[PDB]
Symmetry: D2
Subunit: 359 residues, 4 copies
């Protein structure tokens, strides 16, 4: 029900950075720099600008001190300076609030457009950015858990098909989704850069930000993040994983920052750059769709996500999902999942897999 | 208390093989050969003899067809032929039933002694074994999930200190254990070969066999086993893991064979060969003790284990544990676990970690 | 020298497959299927069609029986059916011989254009292809050395700047090159799909095909290929590596097929999809540029490459490079290389690194 | 010429435990072992640095000692009981070797210790007593992408391998693999106590010299990272040989050179040898997969270069020349030969190294 503008979509290259508001900058720095090993591009008493090992643009993550932890912006880089004008015209045709800043909203980004999009998310579009030393061969700096790239964002929104249509008009290509036989869609993944995704929609009350994901080179890098968190006696901040995803086929881990912003560590999905890339649809009751090994999805993964801000810095209204809940239909009292479709053996009814019920 | 014999203990080298009774030999072969990649030393319509990648003795595992799935023997290799006599004299002094076979109980083993030990377990001691081709450089055969060695057994027994003393007299050294602040021992690990263990005692109703463990070279090999089980749509046979152990520091996975015999895959523990190797005691309520990342221990891991046989092929009666139950004290309705000792934050009261309760 | 056409360039997605002529089809099958584990999409007495683990198009490699081993076609997939028409118009404007087949030149490809390009290489452009089962989660089939994608081609051509300009006009973006202070270019790497390259130019006598490259998930997968070749006692077919590239930063290995077609195994280069991706130039005398660890480049790597065919199936005549030879200036009698620019300590004069001269 | 088997019982040797290396510039050596390789400092002052690997509980695996001439000062083996130190003294006494006993050790963190100038001219130490330290095996907050987890072995250059082998076998070491030719020459032997492929090894050549000290990693990528880091630091000229897969031992490996040219091997994933009838493996010297399984050429410096060793007065041991055939000469020299497949001319190399190279 979001109309396709007459104005052409901006040519979006990829997800580029997120700006997160955090309440205690020093505690956040300990997490993202000391625990996770991200590289400081700039910092002061109010903000920390961080980048991954292989990045050449100024940053992939901005931590901004503020009163309420929330997503401030999720930024996509566009192909040319002119694409920023294209974005402004596009979102103005959609009737969205926009704000244009020739000098950027954060350090190391030039001409940029921020919008309150039709789903209530603060999107930024920019071309201009300050190039920095690309650390991709700085093995003298390489950590055993090195985060090498920003991979994607994941957004919680109550009506997945409505947002899917809007993102497809914007140029995102759907690669995978989760549906049921009744016709409910629970989640969709969509890309620009030729990986499984740049952003994704997860069914739930929204707008809220589900997570920001970074890549590693290898699976052992993700294991090391887990081991290091055990060493630091902060294993309570490992939310879910590590595991192998069904959707995306990536090896993964979810952890929680000091303000409960969820970060995913991700590796080794597949190439999606061909225009006829085969879509994959999974059934919601398939117990291998989220964790391929059938490990249970922790309930907080379905219920918890970050606030997002509007262009005034105020928290966006959250709308209740009315479509069926993935948690409820799979691991809730009236839910079920299977290992083999139609087989009662290896099926779970009214609880999660591996012998667990909801706490 | 089990008396220390006057007779010298047999010099035990290592765990060498297990004989498991299985109910459907073909189904078991699918699991151990086709899924897990173990190498066939000999098979007929009654037995399958299997070895790991780096083994040079005849076998590490014998699958024997029978009416009731159970452990038939846990075999230890001794240093010299004379150690078989030593084991005979030792167990006779303990008042245990023994059976001696100059030409072995299974193919590829020579002079062998089997015993119903003081804890009810069928132990075998042997030196003589038919050598086979050591496959350690046969990379043309190497699987993405290759099992390279037999690492250990784990035994369920009601009274851990009683068993521990017996095993120490036999020459096993304790490397790690789990206790509480009230004098209860929940588990102990003990070695001969200079790894964390060759066998272990887990508190519970027994005698029962908790598992047999095989090693891989690297953590990705264990990940591949999980991945393969997902592709074969048998992820319901992944019981617990993968994870990092607290006790032992090994990367691990537990899976279930067609008869529900538990197999652990294990890698990268540490060297214990010095006689003053520091013993490590973990508190039972430490939520990083079993899984270092704090992932919950699946309840079946505490309740399910294999029957064991006596020397007549009959199932050993099960003696109930009267000491506190690790399940109950950690993840049961009245249980407790912590992430940081003394910190209420990251602690769990009457439920498991990560948001789960017992199903 | 090579003019920019008025006609628009076809939109090229990525390298897609190579057709290689081989002399003994069974021996070639042993190599690509039995040794390297590629998946058969189709085969008969004359050809074998093979694909990588993550591929969904019909094939990445066609082995065609013929009298003279040679490259028959290097194929690029284009974005739309209409880009095949664009390709035809573009190459006809360049005055190149072209051949159009509505039902393709090989099985599983539809409308296709083959051209004898300005550098004498047989390029194919196509959109239409038969989709097959994407094997990306078939962990039941996954090898310890699994080849997961086709990554790139590498072409030997006498004049690198001339070929570079032509490929740039065709829409390829240079990511890295090797030059000296005199102004000779020795090699260039250029991409469409957002990795370091889809093809590359290596200075030398040509046209010849230097190699076709496949990727693995992890570095251990490349190690396994070397280990397996040692086990099969064909380590003499390991040409160079394994190693870490300076240019591209990828972990690599070069091996030789039964007809001495060179295959590279490659993993973990970086993202190049941004239009201002920084272009990296290395000095020819930098001993870390080709192997980052300073291992010597085997002489055959510079001198040997595969013949290429014209559209009639005849071998293309070789044109000699007149520009300086990378072999000669670095490891030849009058060459030199350095570890640290301007440091004689760690420099090599008139010989290779690590204590070796040319055989 | 043969080394007699003493009447006195051999000390029960557990494993290689540490090496003491004399270095010329302590700060430069610290940079290499601590900043490049990530070893953990147990103790340091301005004369010495005591270092241990990730999983070690004894005081140290390596002692760096400032001195005028870079050399091996002692190769230390831990014995099973304090009485094995007495057994070691009695044993070497009966062998007619020079011995020195210190009730309070020769270095910090070691108690009662015996040092000897052994029959092959090497400075061996035997000790039981050592100061236990924090075992860092779960300190993943300190774990490096190239983490060295254990001390694995020593490798010694000696002119007569069979003579050395017999002496080590009497000392209780068990031979696991060796390299020989069809004319009765032995070029190298590997021997263990702790149930891995080796605790020490003999390499045929002019000696006594120390060929290398080896440390383990958990995984192959950890060794790759060491190479990658050296490239990043622009010290790839200190990577001598590798990385590779060994034929003998089956281990993944790398050889690098410290500031004084002391060779360090990084090593992972050999196999279990603890059974007393562990099958022995003999490789032919001309087999081009014996040292590098992938057939990569062995660097000439690997055959010719090795560290001086000291006697008990701190003076360099005189070198005795090998008279048996040279592994370098017979495989990669002008008159050398190696094969890929025994009996196959295809994939063989005459008067040169594999992969297209000659001796520099
Ligand atoms: Ca208590
Ligand atoms: Cl998921
Ligand atoms: Cl456990
Ligand atoms: Cl290269
Ligand atoms: Cl070697
Ligand atoms: Fe995600
Ligand atoms: Fe276990
Ligand atoms: Fe290449
Ligand atoms: Fe070594």
């Amino acid at each position: 029900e979001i109309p396709k503008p007459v104005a052409p979509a901006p040519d979006i290259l990829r997800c580029a950075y997120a700006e997160l508001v955090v309440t205690d900058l020093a505690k956040s720095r300990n997490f993202y720099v000391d625990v996770l090993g991200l590289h400081v591009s700039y910092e002061d008493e109010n903000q920390i600008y961080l980048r991954s090992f292989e990045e050449f643009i100024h940053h992939n993550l901005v931590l901004t001190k503020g009163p309420v932890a929330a997503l401030k912006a999720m930024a996509f880089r566009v192909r040319t300076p002119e694409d920023v004008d294209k974005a402004e015209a596009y979102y103005q045709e959609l009737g969205c609030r926009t704000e244009r800043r020739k000098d950027g909203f954060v350090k190391g980004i030039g001409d940029a457009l921020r919008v309150e999009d039709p789903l209530g998310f603060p999107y930024e579009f920019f071309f201009e950015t300050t190039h920095v030393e690309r650390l991709h061969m700085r093995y003298d700096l390489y950590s055993a858990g090195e985060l090498v790239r920003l991979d994607h964002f994941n957004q919680v929104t109550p009506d997945v098909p409505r947002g899917r249509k809007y993102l497809e008009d914007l140029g995102f290509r759907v690669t995978e989704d989760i549906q049921d036989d009744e016709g409910t869609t629970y989640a969709a993944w969509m890309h620009r850069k030729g990986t499984v995704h740049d952003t994704a929609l997860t069914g739930g009350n929204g707008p809220r930000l589900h997570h920001v994901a970074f890549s590693t080179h290898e699976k052992h890098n993700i294991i090391q993040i887990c081991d290091k968190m055990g060493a630091l006696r902060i294993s309570d901040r490992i939310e879910r994983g590590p595991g192998r995803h069904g959707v995306s086929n990536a090896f993964y881990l979810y952890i929680l920052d000091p303000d409960n912003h969820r970060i995913e560590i991700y590796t080794q999905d597949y190439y999606t750059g061909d225009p006829d890339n085969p879509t994959i649809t999974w059934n919601v009751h398939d117990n291998q769709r989220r964790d391929w090994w059938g490990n249970p999805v922790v309930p907080s993964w379905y219920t918890e996500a970050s606030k997002v801000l509007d262009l005034d810095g105020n928290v966006q209204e959250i709308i209740l999902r009315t479509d069926d809940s993935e948690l409820e239909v799979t691991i809730g009292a009236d839910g079920f999942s299977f290992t083999r479709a139609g087989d009662e053996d290896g099926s779970y009814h009214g609880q999660a897999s591996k012998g667990f019920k909801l706490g």
